[PDB]
From a paper:
KLHL3 is the substrate-recognition subunit of the ubiquitin ligase complex, recruiting substrates for ubiquitylation via its associated Kelch domain. KLHL2 has also been implicated recently as a CUL3 substrate adaptor for WNK kinases. We determined the high-resolution crystal structures of the Kelch domains of human KLHL3 and KLHL2 in separate complexes with the 11-residue WNK4 degron motif.
For example, protonation of WNK4 His566 may explain why this residue is not clearly resolved in the crystal structure of the KLHL3 complex. The binding interface between KLHL3 and WNK4 spans all six Kelch repeats and has a total buried surface area of 510 Å2, with blades II, III and IV participating in the greatest number of contacts. Among the KLHL3 residues, Arg360 contributes the greatest contact area and forms hydrogen bond interactions with WNK4 Glu557, as well as with the main chain atoms of WNK4 Pro558 and Glu560. For example, WNK4 Glu562 has the greatest contact area of any interface residue and protrudes into the cleft between blades III and IV to hydrogen bond with KLHL3 Ser432 (right-hand panel). Perhaps the most notable interaction is the salt bridge formed between KLHL3 Arg528 and WNK4 Asp564.
Residue numbers in the entry:
A (entry chain B): 300 to 585
B (entry chain D): 557 to 565
The structure:
């Protein structure tokens, strides 16, 4: 029995709240709060635990990293990143946790660092070709992808996409998306890389496109029910869940999921108790 | 520093 964990976010300020959606029971519940208020953090499930990385505490961007113990319902602090990163991407590749880009409060970041839970250490790997804050990431077939985001050097929301291979320690550009997406909800389902929503300046998107690494091709799929940027994304049981987010003004309480076989987006029948954006999301066993 | 995400500044 799996549950979906939703970690921090804006509602409308940074919060400590960590919620759990129980799929079988169709119910939201609070679990252990973060040690401090957090939004814009990266969240991943790695080697049996949920990790929460970086973010924003309402005043400063942070380099803190916490791990969640579901048995004791307890968050613990582990090694902090080298850089403060907020609106970063976080992903797991070969059992390393990668912290990709983000914003440190002064500048957007092209730098990338990786965490080993065996040694409890962070180290830099190769930087991206473009600095990217509000960057979505996904891992497919041994590669790490950085999708869209915002480049403060050019002041552009990005349609470009880069691919990282740990074996070469190199980032390369792959096919551009059809559309610029900062704050896209990015995830991987059945070997395909999804870019959902996001924005280009004041224009928020409900459109969705999907990337096949085998063909280096993006294709459009069905629109979401709602315009969303800064939504959390996770994949479970053949479906892509998109959680909360905002439309630039309101934070959304709803969740919707994509079935790639039927090409349909469906709203979760029970909203969160309050709108929440820039929340990270993971799926775990109950 | 501005509290907004970079893309919104
Ligand atoms: Cl930020």
């Amino acid at each position: 029995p799996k549950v979906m964990i939703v970690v921090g976010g804006q509602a409308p300020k940074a919060i400590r709240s960590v919620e759990c959606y129980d799929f079988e029971e169709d119910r939201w519940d609070q679990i252990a709060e973060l040690p401090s208020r957090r939004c814009r953090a990266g969240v991943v499930f790695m080697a049996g635990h949920v990790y929460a990385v970086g973010g924003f505490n309402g005043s400063l961007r942070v380099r803190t990293v916490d791990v969640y113990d579901g048995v004791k319902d307890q968050w613990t602090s582990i090694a902090s990143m080298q850089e403060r990163r907020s609106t970063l991407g976080a992903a797991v590749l070969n059992d390393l946790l990668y912290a990709v880009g983000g914003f440190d409060g002064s500048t957007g970041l092209a730098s990338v660092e990786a965490y080993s839970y065996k040694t409890n250490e962070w180290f830099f790997v190769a930087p991206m070709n473009t600095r990217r804050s509000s960057v979505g990431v996904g891992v497919v077939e041994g590669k790490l992808y950085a999708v869209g985001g915002y480049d403060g050097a050019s002041r552009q929301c990005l349609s470009t996409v880069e691919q990282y291979n740990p074996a070469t320690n190199e980032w390369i550009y792959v096919a551009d998306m059809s559309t610029r997406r900062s704050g896209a909800g990015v995830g991987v389902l059945s070997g395909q890389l999804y870019a959902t929503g996001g924005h280009d300046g004041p224009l928020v998107r409900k459109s969705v496109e999907v990337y096949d690494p085998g063909t280096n091709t993006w294709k459009q799929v069905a629109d979401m029910n709602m315009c969303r940027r800064n939504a959390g994304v996770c994949a479970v049981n053949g479906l892509l869940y998109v959680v909360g987010g905002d439309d630039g003004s309101c934070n959304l309480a709803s969740v919707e999921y994509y079935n790639p076989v039927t090409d349909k987006w469906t709203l979760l029948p029970t909203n969160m108790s309050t709108g929440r954006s820039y929340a990270g999301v993971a799926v775990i066993h109950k | 520093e501005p509290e907004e995400p970079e893309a919104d500044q």
